[PDB]
Antibody
Framework: EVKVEESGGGLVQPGGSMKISCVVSGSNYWMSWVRQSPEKGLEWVAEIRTYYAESVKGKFTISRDDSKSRLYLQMNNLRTEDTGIYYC??????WGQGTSVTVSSAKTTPPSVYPLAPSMVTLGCLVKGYFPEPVTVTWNSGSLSSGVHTFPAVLQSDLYTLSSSVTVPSSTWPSETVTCNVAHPASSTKVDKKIVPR | DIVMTQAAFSNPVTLGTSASISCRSSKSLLHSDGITYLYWYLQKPGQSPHLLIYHLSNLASGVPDRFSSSGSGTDFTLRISRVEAEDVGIYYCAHNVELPRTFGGGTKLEIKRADAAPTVSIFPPSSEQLTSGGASVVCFLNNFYPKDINVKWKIDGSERQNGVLNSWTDQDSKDSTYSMSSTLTLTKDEYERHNSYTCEATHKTSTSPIVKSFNRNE
């Protein structure tokens, strides 16, 4: 089984620099980087067999260690338009997970996590006033995945807010504990917020 | 460089019925070897793209047999027979006949199902948030179909437009429904000076708005 694992990424201000990478498991292989944003869709940027999209020539350097099966993309002097989710893509069959890259004058800000309490009961968590995306939300460390809705974050006044709802039988809350687990890696935040009845 | 054109939204499709997604290339992808270098990817909600079809008509490993594709060198159609709720996602066409490699804009496969009224829930500010000095009222309108929905907030019966933050999910992969979150944020000082907060949801499944409210005095 071929697997493409990628990492690095994060936030920098315009002008900043970042090296991302991925490793293939499972010599004979071309590797490319494709970035995704809502405003430009999927955009191929660079490939090593090196070739670079016109928009990032002189800013990006794609490279590989054939030993380690570990290809890198060095992203120097980054621009706000370089913001997006970057995929390792082995043309044409395999994609990585995607690492987020944010270039913005706005600085890292951790979330405030707030519990939302009132047959079936709905509860939720409010993850407010953070930067940059992403945060991840879990309920009871994964035990509740069915009946969870985590909404897309929305940027307002240079901070993101998201919310998540979970619906469970009334016979399971508050008699049993319900907890939203929130992580925001950019700020080394991890919180486990109990939903207590009011 | 090659422009790959697809529409943003498919014709909607009932479960168990057949779907099609069109794509056009600006340059022909059919070569002298008789092979057309066209590829299809699905990007399921939350996930990366995954390969469905290679060389126009070949089914990728582990892809359901209900998917198929065919076309000329410039016009292609991905077809999905007996559509399942898990087929929901964004489908991309792509070529590999030159650099830059380019993709279509992605076509969202739109599943059509039975109507469903939203489950509405409202929540006052937590003691935690109130200690920070802010006060958010939240309304979830969950698992509804069709996707269009309107939410209005009242404070003490008067409509409040400012301080409202709305978000929408994509079509759910399991039940084919949609959900919305609406948050009204205020300061603790304003919050403690009004008594009733109301979220009202108009959806085609009821001529009357569904309304949830709470009153800080009970």
């Amino acid at each position: 089984e071929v697997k493409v694992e990628e990492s690095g990424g994060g936030l920098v201000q315009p002008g900043g620099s970042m090296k991302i990478s991925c490793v293939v498991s499972g010599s004979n292989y071309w590797m490319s980087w494709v970035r995704q944003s809502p405003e430009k869709g999927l955009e191929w940027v660079a490939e090593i067999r090196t070739y670079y999209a016109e928009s990032v020539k002189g800013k990006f350097t794609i490279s590989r260690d054939d030993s380690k099966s570990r290809l890198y993309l060095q992203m120097n002097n980054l621009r706000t338009e370089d913001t997006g989710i970057y995929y390792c893509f082995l043309p044409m069959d395999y994609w990585g997970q995607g690492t987020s890259v944010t270039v913005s004058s706005a600085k890292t800000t951790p979330p405030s996590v707030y519990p939302l309490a009132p047959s079936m009961v709905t509860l939720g968590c409010l993850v407010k006033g953070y930067f940059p995306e992403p945060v991840t939300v879990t309920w009871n460390s994964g035990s509740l995945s069915s009946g969870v809705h985590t909404f897309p974050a929305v940027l307002q006044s240079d901070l993101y807010t998201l919310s998540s709802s979970v619906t469970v039988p009334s016979s399971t809350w508050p008699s049993e504990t319900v907890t939203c687990n929130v992580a925001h890696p950019a700020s080394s935040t991890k919180v486990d917020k109990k939903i207590v009845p009011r | 460089d090659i422009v790959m054109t697809q529409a943003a939204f498919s014709n909607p499709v009932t479960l168990g019925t057949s779907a099609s997604i069109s794509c056009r290339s600006s340059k022909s992808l059919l070569h002298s070897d008789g092979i057309t270098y066209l590829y299809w990817y699905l990007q399921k909600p939350g996930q990366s793209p995954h390969l469905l079809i290679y060389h126009l008509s070949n089914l990728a490993s582990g892809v359901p047999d209900r998917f198929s594709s065919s076309g000329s060198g410039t016009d292609f159609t991905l077809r999905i027979s007996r559509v399942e709720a898990e087929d929901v996602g964004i489908y991309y066409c792509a070529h590999n006949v030159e650099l830059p490699r380019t993709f279509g804009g992605g076509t969202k496969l739109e599943i059509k199902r039975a109507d469903a009224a939203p489950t509405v829930s409202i929540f006052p500010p937590s003691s935690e948030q109130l200690t920070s000095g802010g006060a958010s009222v939240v309304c979830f309108l969950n698992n509804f179909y069709p996707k269009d929905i309107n939410v209005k907030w009242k404070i003490d019966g008067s409509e409040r437009q400012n301080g409202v933050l709305n978000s929408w999910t994509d079509q759910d992969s399991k039940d084919s429904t949609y959900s919305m979150s609406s948050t009204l944020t205020l300061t603790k000082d304003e919050y403690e000076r009004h008594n009733s907060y109301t979220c009202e949801a108009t959806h085609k499944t009821s001529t009357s708005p569904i309304v949830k409210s709470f009153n800080r005095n009970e």
